[PDB]
Symmetry: D2
Subunit: 283 residues, 4 copies
């Protein structure tokens, strides 16, 4: 598989959306797994998930790497509501657009915020919920906020340098020497090719700051089977949120990877793949 071969578009008309173009990548057939990416500059379905799409297809799954409204080759937008609840509507849109009655969601960071909102609003349309260091769960009992990674993320949004992006990625990864060009250019090309997303994000962050995303009091309402993954060394979202989810969602389990940043799916691909595939297959 490649990005080219899998590339695809489709408009959506849910709630406040209307004739809104969502880019995505699709492969495989059958049961549907929608993978939702992180909030960083130049973030996209493919870029977040290029080590998990193949193995998930082989497992006999319909794999949808969605570009969320306002990133990569999807359409630009400005939100005055918390992006989790908004991205969920975009997801609900792409499912209605493509006749998908139900899907499993895999949400990393902002994505995980999306999946959590999707699961809260549209429970009848979610199968199983995989969360990987999801944002927007309020304050940590230990980490002061903003966290080091979030600081760097806004710094990159503000002054998109090549050297800055690099330093953002050295904080996102536990092992910094794992930095590939195919990754680094994937993000750097994505920021350049649509620099309207950057300014749109900062404005939205002004209208709905991270503190408004907190869905914590509603967690006792999530019914789907939940698999929470965390990188032990995540400098973007604090480890103790993993526990908050475990205690509040009725049916959850938590897996933490050592020597791992915010990208468990990337930095620990193999283990992540087989752990999640098995969770879908057997839980």
């Amino acid at each position: 598989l490649t990005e080219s071969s899998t590339s695809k578009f489709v408009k959506i008309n849910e709630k406040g959306f209307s004739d809104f173009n969502i880019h995505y990548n699709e492969a495989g057939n059958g049961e549907t797994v929608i993978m939702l990416h992180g909030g960083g500059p130049g973030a996209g379905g493919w870029s977040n998930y290029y080590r998990n799409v193949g193995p998930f297809v082989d497992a006999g799954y319909r794999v949808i790497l969605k570009d969320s409204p306002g990133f990569n080759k999807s359409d630009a937008v400005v939100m005055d509501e918390q992006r989790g609840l908004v991205n969920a509507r975009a997801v609900k849109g792409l499912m209605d657009a493509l006749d998908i009655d139900r899907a499993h969601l895999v949400g990393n960071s902002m994505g995980g915020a999306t999946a959590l909102n999707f699961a809260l609003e549209y429970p009848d349309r979610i199968g199983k919920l995989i969360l990987m260091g999801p944002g927007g769960l309020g304050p940590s009992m230990f980490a002061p906020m903003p966290m080091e990674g979030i600081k760097l993320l806004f710094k990159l949004y503000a002054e998109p340098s090549y050297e800055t992006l690099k330093q953002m990625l050295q904080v996102f990864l536990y092992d910094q020497s794992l930095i590939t060009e195919e990754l680094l250019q994937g993000r750097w090309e994505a920021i350049q090719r649509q620099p309207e997303h950057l300014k749109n994000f900062l404005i939205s962050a002004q209208k709905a700051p991270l503190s408004t995303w907190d869905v914590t009091a509603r967690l006792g309402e999530i019914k789907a089977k939940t698999f929470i993954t965390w990188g032990r060394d995540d400098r973007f979202v604090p480890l103790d949120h993993g526990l908050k989810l475990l205690w509040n969602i009725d049916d959850a389990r938590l897996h933490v990877f050592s020597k791992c940043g915010q990208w468990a799916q990337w930095e620990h691909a193999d283990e992540f793949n087989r752990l999640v595939i098995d969770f879908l297959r057997h839980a």
Copy 2:
């Protein structure tokens, strides 16, 4: 051969440091790559009783499984120990491996058996493959939980005044869903208590000589070179959840998995998931 507690039951004399001609009971099945499972420290614990829901699937996955009765438990020989039990138990595991000609084994350890597995990986790094830990005991204070924990107090209470009803109370604290407690489980533990009452008294004499605080190997976790799978039950009232994080941070190559709606026996209360996760870890980690 049918796989039953009796058809798998075996004995081996071990000779290692402070053990001479010491009879160790174990249950064994399967062939090839070896997994040794080490049980908890409560009255009447033993290998079969802790691991009977795991043995079949591990054997079917192609492992040789050894459910070891630790010294001073169940059908192994009696002992009063004057050193910390994790280390003495690890000597016995090594003794059993030498006696059975086993060069390397994966270790699965629950509670006291987790402490055993950790001491074994510290002392005998060349003889361990992978390490699987389920809520290991004796890792010092918790950052949140007052000690002794509720499970620990019931453990000592049962050791000192054994009764069926106190056994039942203990087991109700050990498990998240107390309605899963069968009369057969209970009667198995109760028979082990009644058939080997010397183990209880010897345990109490030994704990006075080397209290639980002496089992703390925290300072050495940095030496462990085995790939490690830590499992915890979210609802464990015996050893606290923050110890799972302590191991995750101090062992070089670890992952942690926490089961919801689970007390201190994840291998038993969530056997199917446990089996699937650990088998997968042994095969592909």
Copy 3:
């Protein structure tokens, strides 16, 4: 001072209350400190606070040891709403009853739940907020619930034995050999003399379980200056709630006492007294 010398009653008519008799003890003059006791069988203003009333009066404070609706010499009742919100109304009642325009609150356990609700509903009537291991803040990130102390509390409510009460107190105190008769009889006489409170409590616990008391999502609304105290070895409410309060209340500080159970005010009287007096005097 003694219980006799300070004993006093007054009816109240707030919201659902009407001609409802609140017992309390008062001493001293000037600025008002209302001390609110814990949820245990035979719990009462005096019994919780007999080492803190004298020293607080000397400090020049008006000290009100309130018996909460349904304990000790106050009137019996059954609640179908979480007792924190209900006890707050009773407190708001005793203040209107006695022409108190403002007060500082000192809440231990159930009391702390009260103070937190009082501070949320009636902020204009609260000065400064002292919380000592307050209940009803949801699940712990570490302790499974119900906690050992809560289990024992309901066991004592169910079968009020003298030996049972004793075992409840051995779990409430870090140092068990500190058990005094003047305490033990204070509780044992209180349970006997009004055994209707016991059954009323169990029914209310049925109508509004501990899980309904959680005010966590509203903590960002508390404006009063807050002093959170905790016993390190508290087996009734988990230590990590101390942190939750610290992070969520806008103006808070946290003090933890070593070798200390649920009764910081009792087990560490001196240090507690001077710490709180100074907080009132200078914060």
Copy 4:
């Protein structure tokens, strides 16, 4: 006499283990019962710079206050250390106490000075009264926070490439309210960096010989017999909050106090409350 940085400034030669005729700078005022205050480990740190908001009130409360410049900081003599800095610093504190005929002192320690205070209480239990710790360094891994922490990375960055703007970045991470950072604070630290650049390079050479992981005294906290007051800033990005709990659980007689809206300098960012709480602890604990 007026109390100013200069009117209080003194030197004393110390001779203790690996120190011979080693000049220690300190600031001193007041008389009687002795409190020694030990500073942090960042570039340009020193006693005055860390504690100038505390000295007046402690002296007025009736204490003799000593703000000590640790070896290889500020106006004390230069040194490249080959052992963990907490212990070497504790030797220097003991050396200063012997040279000034001080039998017993209360110790207040911030960050590196907290590590110093802990080593001193371990090694010289008879020479300490009470122990006050503010976010002490080197207590090993955190259960929540990735390491090195953000403050630590800025510390090493500033040591290796000193610049005024990097100093400002560091100080902005140290403090909760960055708008409290005065030009005078900045210029004081910056002058100490520029006037003693050898301290920076010596610090880096020393940290290669005994890294921060070697400062961990966790395993010994159980030996500390001093009544201990632990203070933390909720918002500390240099040493993590769970270490406050680690000390609370492992030292026999401790209390913990956490200030909201506070980074790693509680003594400075919340001086008034800090002063009031610690003075009260010294008088009545």
